């Protein structure tokens, strides 16, 4: 299934995921596409920050859901 990840660059990343993927796996897929290290990725769904050890299903993230990605860097 596809989900969307918006960033403050204005580009939206499209990911191919499964409901059982952990947030850690999702950050690994973002790194493979965009090169952002997982420890710099802070993922948010509907105002809730996502924990690395949980899965997409735990947050009821379904197909074509939109996540928000922000960095920890703030120069």
């Amino acid at each position: 299934m596809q989900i969307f990840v918006k960033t403050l660059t204005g580009k939206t990343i499209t990911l191919e995921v499964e409901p059982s993927d952990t947030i850690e796996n999702v950050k690994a897929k973002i790194q493979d596409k965009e090169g952002i290290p997982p420890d710099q990725q802070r993922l948010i769904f509907a105002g809730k920050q996502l924990e690395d050890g949980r899965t997409l299903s735990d947050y009821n993230i379904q197909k074509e859901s939109t996540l928000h990605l922000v960095l920890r860097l703030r120069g």
Partner: protein, 234 residues
């Protein structure tokens, strides 16, 4: 076509004076003394070569961009402002919004970002290797730096933007809105004058990892993509 807040950013750029838009002698680079924590704006201005953005224009653009990004759940984000700093992703978008304008005509302006973190189970980065730069003559870095002196003072890591530019002779110059190096002790006395230092960006990065604790680094610039930065020799 374009959002009203993005158009406003483009309009301000189009009216700016940019005496250092192209390579110039190092004394003619535009380098602003730091105001509050607006080093992202100062670095953008040094990158483009003039007072392209003022703090009110940039902060207004950033707030509206936050509203379009996440809307009413913006209360989930850490504050970004002139007083607290800005994400490298915002700097990339601001610069890419200038691609195709009459000032950037004929210049490589496909701006991207590369971010490097420590290896697993490491406290800091031991080596940063820049990609082959080709003819690229302007870059922005966001560095997060700790140090023995900072730990001794009980100070937080510094998270800071700087710009790099090539002069008319092809030599690289660090253009920093602070008056002391990112890896300097936090209580260091200074004159307030911005840093204008002739050094290659690779050598500047090597100096940080040799003198202090590089926690994170973002490289922003034309032709830069996610995989540009590595941590192995080349």
């Amino acid at each position: 076509a374009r959002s009203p807040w993005d158009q406003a950013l483009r309009d301000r750029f189009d009216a700016a004076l940019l005496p250092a838009l192209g390579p110039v002698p190092h004394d003619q680079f535009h380098v602003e003394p730091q105001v509050a924590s607006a080093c992202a704006i100062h670095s953008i201005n040094a990158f483009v070569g003039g007072p392209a953005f003022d703090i009110p224009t940039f902060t207004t653009w950033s707030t509206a961009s936050t509203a379009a990004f996440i809307g009413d759940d913006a209360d989930a984000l850490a504050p970004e402002s002139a007083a607290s700093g800005f994400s490298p992703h915002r700097v990339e978008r601001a610069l890419n919004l200038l691609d195709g304008t009459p000032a950037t005509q004929g210049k490589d302006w496909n701006i991207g970002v590369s971010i490097l973190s420590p290896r697993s189970g490491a406290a800091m980065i031991t080596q940063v290797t820049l990609p082959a730069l080709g003819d690229t003559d302007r870059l922005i870095f966001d560095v997060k730096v700790g140090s023995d002196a900072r730990t001794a003072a009980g100070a937080d890591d510094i998270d800071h933007f700087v710009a790099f530019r090539k002069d008319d002779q092809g030599a690289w110059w660090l253009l920093d809105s602070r008056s002391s190096e990112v890896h300097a002790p936090p209580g260091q006395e200074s004159s307030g004058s911005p840093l204008r230092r002739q050094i290659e960006p690779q050598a500047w990065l090597n100096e940080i990892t040799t003198t202090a604790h590089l926690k994170t680094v973002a490289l922003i610039g034309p032709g830069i993509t996610g995989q540009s930065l590595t941590d192995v020799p080349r």
